[PDB]
């Protein structure tokens, strides 16, 4: 979850 669930 490197984008913290904000983007693909």
């Amino acid at each position: 979850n490197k984008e913290n669930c904000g983007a693909a």
Partner: antibody, heavy 113, light 111 residues
């Protein structure tokens, strides 16, 4: 507490080139994607691009592939935004943000005089 | 690029009243991986933006449950059950399904 500390306001002449910095506290930037976002009072928010501090891979919005250069340094846990050939439009507040725009820095206000 | 259209653009309301903000995208934000990367930001006056909602309906830490995110595909809505002083500012929806990341033009909530 997680903090994204950005460098101070820049007041520069048309044609120069500034380099903004974003020092992260409370997490490791290599575990995230570091983003940069531009904001103008009328035009609104514009995604500049994104960097993976773990490898250095960058992705830019086509509008800024030319203008902006995003770098990162894991040793100082800091991300950077370099802007070339600043014009009157480049006058804006520039934000850094961690993965998925979860948390943002206080922003660095650039003024092109 | 994905165009994010927010309505209304400005919202002047009384303290305690509910609020509803629309967010429409030019294409589907349902990613092939099966998740919809539509998010909501709040930027208080003089403050920096902050994420309120992610994955259509998930609330970020600290966000009051007066906020509820909903919708699917291209049509999304942010609702506030009761507007408080801390809820004033500009709300931005944005998508992370397709790159480049794009933002709505923002909805100004004031009294």
């Amino acid at each position: 507490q997680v903090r994204l500390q950005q460098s101070g306001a820049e007041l520069v002449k048309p044609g120069a080139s500034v380099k903004l910095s974003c020092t992260a506290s409370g997490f490791n930037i290599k575990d995230d994607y570091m983003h940069w976002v531009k904001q103008r009072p009328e035009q609104g928010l514009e995604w500049i691009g994104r960097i993976d501090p773990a490898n250095g891979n960058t992705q830019y919005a086509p509008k800024f592939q030319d203008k902006a250069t995003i770098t990162a340094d894991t040793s100082s846990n800091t991300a950077y935004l370099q802007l070339t050939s600043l014009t009157s439009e480049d006058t804006a507040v520039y934000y850094c943000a961690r993965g998925g725009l979860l948390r943002w820095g206080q922003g660095t206000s650039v003024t092109v005089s | 690029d994905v165009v994010m259209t927010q309505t209304p653009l400005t919202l002047s309301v009384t303290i305690g009243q509910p609020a509803s903000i629309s967010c429409k995208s030019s294409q589907s934000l349902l990613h092939s991986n099966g998740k919809t990367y539509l998010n909501w930001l709040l930027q208080r006056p003089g403050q920096s933006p902050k994420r309120l909602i992610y994955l259509v309906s998930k609330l970020d830490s600290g966000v009051p449950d007066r906020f509820t995110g909903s919708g699917s595909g291209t049509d999304f809505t942010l609702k506030i059950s009761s507007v408080e002083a801390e809820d004033l500012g500009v709300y931005y929806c944005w998508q992370g399904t397709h790159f480049p990341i794009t933002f709505g033009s923002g909805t100004k909530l004031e009294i």
